[PDB]
Amino acid sequence: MQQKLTSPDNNLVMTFQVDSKGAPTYELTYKNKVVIKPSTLGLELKKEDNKLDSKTNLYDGFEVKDTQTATFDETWQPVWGEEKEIRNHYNELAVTLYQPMNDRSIVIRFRLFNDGLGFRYEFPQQKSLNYFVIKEEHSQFGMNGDHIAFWIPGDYDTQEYDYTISRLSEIRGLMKEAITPNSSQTPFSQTGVQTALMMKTDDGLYINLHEAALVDYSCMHLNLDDKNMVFESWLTPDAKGDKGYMQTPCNTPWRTIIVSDDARNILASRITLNLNEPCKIADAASWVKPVKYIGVWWDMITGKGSWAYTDELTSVKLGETDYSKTKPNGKHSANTANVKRYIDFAAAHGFDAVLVEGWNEGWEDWFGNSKDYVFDFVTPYPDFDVKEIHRYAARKGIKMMMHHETSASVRNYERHMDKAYQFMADNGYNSVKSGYVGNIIPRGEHHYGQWMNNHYLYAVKKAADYKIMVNAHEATRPTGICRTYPNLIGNESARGTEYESFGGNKVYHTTILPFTRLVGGPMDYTPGIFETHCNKMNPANNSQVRSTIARQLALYVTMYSPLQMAADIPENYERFMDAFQFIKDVALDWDETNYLEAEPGEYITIARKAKDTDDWYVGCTAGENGHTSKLVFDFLTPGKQYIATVYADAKDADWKENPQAYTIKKGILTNKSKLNLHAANGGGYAISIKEVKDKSEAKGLKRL
């Protein structure tokens, strides 16, 4: 009767069966500890526009018709990632479920790894199941206790919320305050949360609930039954309230449960990526590449500068408004002379590209007007010389990063997309930062519905045809699709550094993101703010970045991404050029990654080996209690000497009272070295460890 699937190491066991009413039921244990209590699986379908009642049932009345098992064990290499190779090793169980009352069958495929379980529903092409609409997916995740969760409010339009750390039973009472103001937001439940969801159990376990390969389907959130402690899939509705237009053969994305008694193993898990389809960009390795950049950006985010060219018009209309006849507001940062200054800085310090926002016509009306024809993505303002900027950047060996804020007007963006990408190709742009700020147009749709998920992928696939890399802000959070389309080098899709200018992010924010948001794909977090007091940029902005300078440096290692921005303005980096050296030195791609220390909400310490080098980089980020590390460099090569530079919080450093106090020490390290470092409140540290290649490097240096 019951089906049992075991992980390769025998530590995890998944038991499957249908109850007495034919409802698919599964459960999972880890080291003999209950991780997932008996939980049901199934979906309810929309009644077909006027048997008709029984057809809506795709949740019970099932009989196990057939079962197939198999084992997979292959290694693959991502174009860019946290390590050179990833091993995909799992035991699989596929259950064919027949539903007599509707004469149709579905398949539930289970893949069990040593670090977690993944499952998905498969809908075979058959006589009685072709086109169908999903009313709701009912995938349950029954918890064995009132765990501690690290969560953000379930929302169909934004994920730019600070995390909350509380018991599952406390979520309901905390939801109201957890939902802060945002340009576009649609919370759905007093107990709804987003994925990836991170939890810590009283019996020493760490559990992460998420999904993988979100394609041709609506984004999954989780709704908590806080009486029975059961999380259940809650999909994003379209403009009519429906949750998915399907056509067999088709599959739902995978649902994942990553678990371990060691928090570091959650970060090390590659289940999400392993469950995605293999790379579909044949020549990816020839053009896809990591990018370290700076940009004309923080000016506008802080309010010092503006995206708009003029402030004298009540509104603008592309093709009618003649900007050449308008009065400059004197705050437009995207002007040729200023852009060249950034290009100079980028070239002088080894950066790959320079982002510039506010370069094109239309910014006057970019915010909250639900404007359809808001941008054309190709017409520059009078003070932005596309060709001259291109000429200069190219001569300096710098690439300009295109900016495509859509103001959430999606049909408008698609209509202009080919011309926009061609414009990029014709003017030397091979990477683009897109955005979707505001309520979606078509009006009625949400940012994470099936409709928009299709758009985001459409944009990435078309970009691949033009050999363009994409960094999409406000898009649906990643679920590992980067394996399939490596040109998607980034997404924000979470609360980033920009909010440190909008009131600030919680001190423990970066000690949570790697356990949640980063599972499924890198984030364009835009770290590197040295002048943490925003009033120095804009007197009217009293927001303060909750970090020390040393912790900002650490983020280049603790916030993984092949796309890394040094977000502050050149002048501020010039004020602390000694600390800036770490940002200049740090790599963007890795051959190896060692998670040294990890505890969600408290601290994260990671060491990574730069790809194709013998150099290592270390970073530690900590919460309000700071953190003391006892580092052991036994991961370094035996018999080798290393030049180590330690960027750490000075004594009494503090994110609030003394954020710019840091020390820099240079010495020698070997695999026998041990170091004690203390991360302050909202602080951390960064270490560059370069293999000695010449005696004339250790001169005057002593062992640390």
Place this chain on the structure above:
Amino acid sequence: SHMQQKLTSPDNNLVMTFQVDSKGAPTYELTYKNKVVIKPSTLGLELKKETKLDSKTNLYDGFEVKDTQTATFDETWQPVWGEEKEIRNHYNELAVTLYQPMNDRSIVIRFRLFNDGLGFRYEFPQQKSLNYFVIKEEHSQFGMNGDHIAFWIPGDYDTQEYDYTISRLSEIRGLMKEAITPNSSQTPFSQTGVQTALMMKTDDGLYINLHEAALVDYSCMHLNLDDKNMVFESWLTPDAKGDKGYMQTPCNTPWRTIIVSDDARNILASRITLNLNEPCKIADAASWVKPVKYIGVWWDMITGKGSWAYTDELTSVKLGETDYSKTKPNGKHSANTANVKRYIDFAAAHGFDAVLVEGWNEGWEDWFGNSKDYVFDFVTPYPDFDVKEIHRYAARKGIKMMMHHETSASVRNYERHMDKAYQFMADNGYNSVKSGYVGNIIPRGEHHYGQWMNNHYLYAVKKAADYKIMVNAHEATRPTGICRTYPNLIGNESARGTEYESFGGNKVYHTTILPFTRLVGGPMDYTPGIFETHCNKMNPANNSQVRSTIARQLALYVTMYSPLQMAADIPENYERFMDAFQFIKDVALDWDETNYLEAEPGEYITIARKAKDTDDWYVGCTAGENGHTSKLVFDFLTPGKQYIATVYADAKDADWKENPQAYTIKKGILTNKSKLNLHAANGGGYAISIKEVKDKSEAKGLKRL
């Protein structure tokens, strides 16, 4: 303030009186020859709100006249194609600037009064307190002076493919249920809602038409009747969230029109709709836009004889995955090279310009009602359709192929494929395309006539113009004169066409109403020309019968104006009646002059037109269930000239139901002194070709008629 204003038509017959009432509501009234046409009616709009009412939502009262400007316009222009060579645009104008103290904002209401009607629109100037706004409801009233007889179809956000109903305004409510027949995509909105291009006949001898003009960047207007006070009010089409228009100043609403006369023929002669549209924007239009007479592989599938699909063995298909080469032909796929060539041969042998082919591309297996997103790619042909060979062959025969772009209402999908689709047309010699939008709109939640889709339809036409492509769009929002601005929009169905004669039939009087309603604003691709009226001969399972005689079908080439005319039957049926087919072969598609000889909505329409750049005339008469007797006087012909006339008429015992294929053909001479008595049978009519004699040899052996 500001004593009521008076606006008069050039001929003094119409008078529009405007005044803001005691509560600040803009009010207008209209009289024709001292008879009330429009009783005091208010104008204004309610806006969407951006513990108490927000005054900003109020754009209907609390106004005061701040300024007024009058002007007269009198200019003549020439359409690329039309019912006559030149159109005179002559009106007296009154523009009223209305200031709203409570919101510190102003709007303008512009009135244009012609000898045959009134047009008005709202204008929203760019200003400090009015920039971006959303319309909740437009409140344009049209107060009737009585319980008039109306020729209407159910107000609907998704379809206009309904038969007309003739009833008193007070009877609409009780007839609505039965007037709403089954359709693939329909959204009725009121028990007393009707579609615009509403025709009425009053007890005191007036004919009134209510409609709109220049429907651009705005939601389609329908009319909702208050049958207790007989007041019609603008009812716009909602978007997926229920809103009725996203506006940004400066902007204007489309024009609202009231066409009136005591002579029904003058309703047909009115050019107010076209005159209110913006002038042509296609500079080189004359060099590529041209009328098209065509036939097509079409009726086969409409009747069920053939299929659009290539195979019947699949539960569904997925473009790019389904390999049609490995599928079994269903043996009913009409869109195959050899068959298409037969049509091309026929088109060339009889002087047609183009051949339409439907079911040529992959995907038709799932085209109907699945709300399928990636339903077509508009470029990949089925295994049995050789695009290049057909192009070479058609070119060799002097024929052009008409592209078919059924979208199955999946709009984002069509837009994503549009440039490649139009480029494919250009690369393969297709200069015209018949598009379609069958099914509920995708994005799901939108309706066929909302602001969103109206934008799409125009987007498709404007892009087509860049490719020098002409468009004929089925299921799109009904026309409002935009063809003046974009002459490449040579057609729309957007009403119940001949296809329904195969779906149970159209009412016998249908074609005696369309010219008074649907045709106001633009031509219709009605696809006339069915000679074998019994569909069971095409498909035994189809017992539908076309409600027409053969002679009436010929008449439609003159009474259903269009620069795009199809001869819808299959070649074999035209072969059976080649003598009658001669009229379809001879009739012109564009005209220098049009004379409306007889006209009564629901009963009969008789029209005479002079072919452009010729001295030849064509006449047609279409009648309802009571038939019609005409006393034709050919004084519109040129004095002293001889004409070779061929009369195609119903036999004395003809009847659409019992004897539809009984006709007579007479050839003789006509002069401006000639007179003919003709009788159109029940559901019948007649057609006449009148060619000026160019060589005395042509009149040899012929006598005067």
